[PDB]
Write a protein that binds this DNA or RNA. Structure first.
Ligand SMILES: [Mg+2]
Lengths: 105, 675
DNA sequence: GATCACACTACC
DNA sequence: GTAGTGTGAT
């Protein structure tokens, strides 16, 4: 259910998409990213048709993150109409994520 | 004999006022203080010691006190004051001769904390006086509530300054007596604090006289300066800067930026077991933050939700770690590592790196060019010691020279180091060397550029070796150098394919060329290099004999003696029995070149030529086996060149050298042409 | 099997 | 400012 983005597919998959898209900027060497990954998998399946969860690995795709001023990871950016609607940084739990989404959707 | 010191308002270049001076007279055993209005009486006292055929002791007087007094006497009193070289003794010069195995802060210009080894105590105190005075001054000001301004402690005379001046002489006297107690340089049967100047130089070891003449001459050389073409370097800098930017533009496109952990406070701990995970990047755990305040909380953090602080890093070609990171990702497997375990990333290694991505392979050449460009920019313009930062108002660079800075007796150069200007054979070397030249100095009367005489000692290292092996081969090697062809002789001795291979091979033994570096001359490694050395030595028994004779005087790692006797009799400290022969060779060459430039200047002056820009010639730089001399006319340049050859022959005869010594001179407008 | 100055990064 | 690495010259 999770969309794996690339720098070259970002503009089309995120900025010009319909409906809400949650983007997770992560790296394999980050402990916290590893913590939330399992959480995002369950969120994608639970919110399908309601939300699209996508991931962008900042090591293999170095061009995008800088444009959004990433300063920490994981960084969850909620996009709506090609604009960043909301943003949270850190390994939130299932509940903090669910309430973050429900609240912003 | 008298010991003395002065305090003035600035460094030699801009000193305008005498603050005070102190004189200790051994004949009366009394200290006398001279305040600002006693300047004329101070000079009178110094001239009275000269009238008696006496001696004047200063610590660093050759470079500062003596020329400062001449300058200040003319400026403040309209008086001509010129202490003769023969009447002056310098305890700093003496210390550098006797304690040549020790470093020193060169009167506080160097941070004592960064020097390796121990430091002689009295000299340490003398070098630190300025800094100690400044701290007392600053302390006293603040105790009274007024602001301290950089350098204000030297603007006016005050009694604290006078007290430091007295202490200075007290310590200089102590230092002096400690140095005169060294029986190797000063015969114990003579009291050197009770003799006239002629006795002092004639009864002390020859090295004492030579080091003072060298320091006197090099102080003059520093004052002369090396004429420098500022505009040319400013234009070279624009060119280099533009190329640097273009290389960076190309390299940053090829090697993209990335993120790295940065600013993490706490350690990442496994969420389930709690096991600390020291290797993971450090994290931060928001103390505040939530989803709602319900009104939404538009803050980025959530209390308890950890994250890893990171920073964006752009590829930096000057970073050998960035280079290593990107090349390994491109498939490079390092073979050479450093003690700290880091992969070696130098030009030789980079030359050998092979990665299959064409663009990244080509980018390695861009990286090597970038490192070289930066090297040039740092030396000429951006470094703390860049030429553009040191060129003075007179259009000259006045580099400092420590006449006996190295253990072997070689001089050291700094601020900036004029002995490390890129050679004409290296990238941009021609433009660098061309910017240093007599042509850039316009005569004070006629406005016409001066000309340059560049003179070097011919193959000095091999002739020194020939000299020392003459005891074993009866001059065979020396005979081959000056009559046959020593290079092809060594080529056969070794086995190397061509003559030039032998020239590289021979210089190799001299300038740290290891076995791998040797075999690497014929296209191989260690073995073909470890065999070439052995073969050479078996076919040149005299060198083997020399080596064993040198070590038998040093070893039995128990030492029989930790020093070798130099050509002028001084002790030359030997660091390793293995470095003994090179220590012996480098020392001989250094002393030969030192006496040579001293004798050359004396003969020119004997011929009636005046040393200085207001005269006929000016020493501009002395770089080990070579001197660059500015000359008012081409005719003088010719005389200097001929005189230098005469002086070299005089030196060879003076020390009964077994190999004939020679020089070669070239006349031109700058250092590029006079190479 | 040499002597020495100095710059640039990375870290405190 | 210090430690580690390299380059500039003989
Ligand atoms: Mg002084």
């Amino acid at each position: 259910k999770i969309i794996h983005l690339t720098d070259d597919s970002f503009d089309t998959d995120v900025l010009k998409a319909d409906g809400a898209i949650l983007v997770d900027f992560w790296a394999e060497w980050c402990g916290p990213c590893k913590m939330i990954a399992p959480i995002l998998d369950e969120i994608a399946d639970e919110y399908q048709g309601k939300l699209t969860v996508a991931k962008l690995n900042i090591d293999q795709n170095p061009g995008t993150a800088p444009k959004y001023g990433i300063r920490g990871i994981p960084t969850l950016l909620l996009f709506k109409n090609g604009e960043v609607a909301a943003t949270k940084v850190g390994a939130l739990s299932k509940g903090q994520l669910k309430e973050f989404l429900d609240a912003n959707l | 004999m008298i010991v003395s010191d002065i305090e003035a308002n600035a460094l030699l270049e801009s000193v305008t006022k005498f603050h005070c001076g102190v004189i200790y007279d051994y004949s009366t055993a009394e200290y006398v203080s001279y305040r600002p209005s006693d300047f004329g009486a101070y000079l009178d006292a110094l001239e009275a010691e000269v009238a008696r055929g006496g001696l004047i002791v200063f610590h660093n007087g050759h470079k500062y006190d003596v020329p400062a007094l001449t300058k200040l006497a003319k400026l403040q009193l309209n008086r001509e004051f010129h202490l003769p070289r023969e009447n002056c003794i310098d305890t700093l010069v003496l210390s550098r001769l006797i304690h040549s195995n020790l470093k020193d802060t060169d009167m506080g210009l160097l941070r004592s904390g960064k020097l390796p080894g121990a430091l002689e105590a009295w000299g340490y105190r003398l070098g630190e006086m300025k800094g100690e005075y400044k701290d007392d001054f600053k302390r006293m000001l603040e105790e009274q509530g007024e602001e301290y301004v950089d350098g204000m402690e030297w603007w006016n005379f005050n009694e604290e300054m006078m007290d430091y001046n007295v202490q200075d002489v007290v310590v200089t006297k102590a230092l002096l007596e400690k140095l005169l107690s060294d029986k190797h340089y000063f015969p114990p049967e003579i009291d050197f604090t009770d003799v006239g100047y002629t006795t002092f130089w004639s009864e002390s070891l020859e090295a004492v006289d030579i080091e003072h003449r060298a320091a006197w001459l090099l102080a003059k050389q520093e004052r002369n300066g090396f004429p420098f073409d500022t505009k040319a370097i400013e234009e070279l800098y624009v060119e280099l800067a533009a190329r640097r930017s273009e290389l960076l533009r190309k390299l940053t496109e090829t090697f993209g930026s990335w993120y790295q952990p940065k600013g993490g406070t706490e350690m990442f701990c496994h969420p389930r077991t709690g096991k600390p995970l020291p290797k993971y990047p450090r994290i931060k755990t928001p103390k505040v933050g939530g989803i709602f305040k319900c009104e939404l909380d538009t803050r980025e953090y959530v209390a308890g939700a950890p994250y890893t602080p990171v920073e964006h890093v752009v590829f930096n070609p000057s970073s050998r770690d960035h280079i290593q990171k990107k090349l390994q990702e491109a498939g490079w497997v390092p073979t050479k590592y450093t003690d700290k375990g880091a992969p070696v990333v130098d030009d030789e290694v980079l030359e050998g790196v092979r990665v299959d991505d064409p663009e990244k392979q080509a980018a390695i050449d861009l990286i090597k060019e970038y490192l070289m460009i930066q090297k040039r920019i740092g030396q000429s313009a951006e470094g703390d010691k860049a030429w553009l930062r040191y060129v003075a108002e007179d259009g000259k660079i006045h580099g400092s020279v420590n006449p006996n800075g190295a253990v072997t007796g070689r001089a050291t150069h700094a601020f900036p180091n004029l002995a490390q200007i890129p050679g004409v054979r290296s990238p941009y070397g021609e433009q660098c060397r061309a910017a240093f030249g007599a042509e850039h100095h316009l005569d004070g009367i006629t406005g016409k550029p001066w000309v340059q005489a560049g003179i070097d000692a011919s193959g000095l290292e091999l002739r020194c070796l020939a000299h020392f092996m003459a005891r074993f081969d009866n001059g065979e090697y020396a005979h081959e150098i000056l009559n046959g062809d020593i290079h092809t002789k060594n080529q056969i001795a070794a086995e190397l394919p061509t003559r030039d291979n032998a020239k590289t091979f021979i210089y190799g033994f001299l300038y740290g060329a290891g076995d791998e570096k040797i075999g690497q001359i014929v296209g191989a490694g260690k073995e073909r290099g470890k065999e070439l050395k052995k073969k050479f030595l078996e076919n040149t028994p005299a060198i083997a004999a020399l080596r064993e004779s040198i070590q038998q005087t040093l070893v039995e790692v128990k030492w029989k003696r930790r020093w070798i006797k130099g050509l002028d009799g001084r002790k030359v400290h030997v660091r390793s029995p293995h470095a003994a022969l090179n220590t012996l060779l480098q020392s001989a060459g250094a002393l030969i070149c030192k006496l040579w430039i001293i004798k050359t200047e004396e003969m020119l002056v004997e011929k009636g030529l005046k040393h200085g820009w207001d005269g006929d010639f000016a020493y501009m730089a002395w770089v080990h086996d070579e001197i660059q001399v500015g000359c008012r006319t081409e005719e003088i340049a010719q005389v200097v060149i001929e005189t230098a050859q005469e002086a070299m022959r005089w030196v060879g005869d003076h020390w009964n050298f077994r190999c004939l010594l020679d020089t070669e001179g070239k006349m031109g407008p700058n250092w590029a042409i006079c190479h």
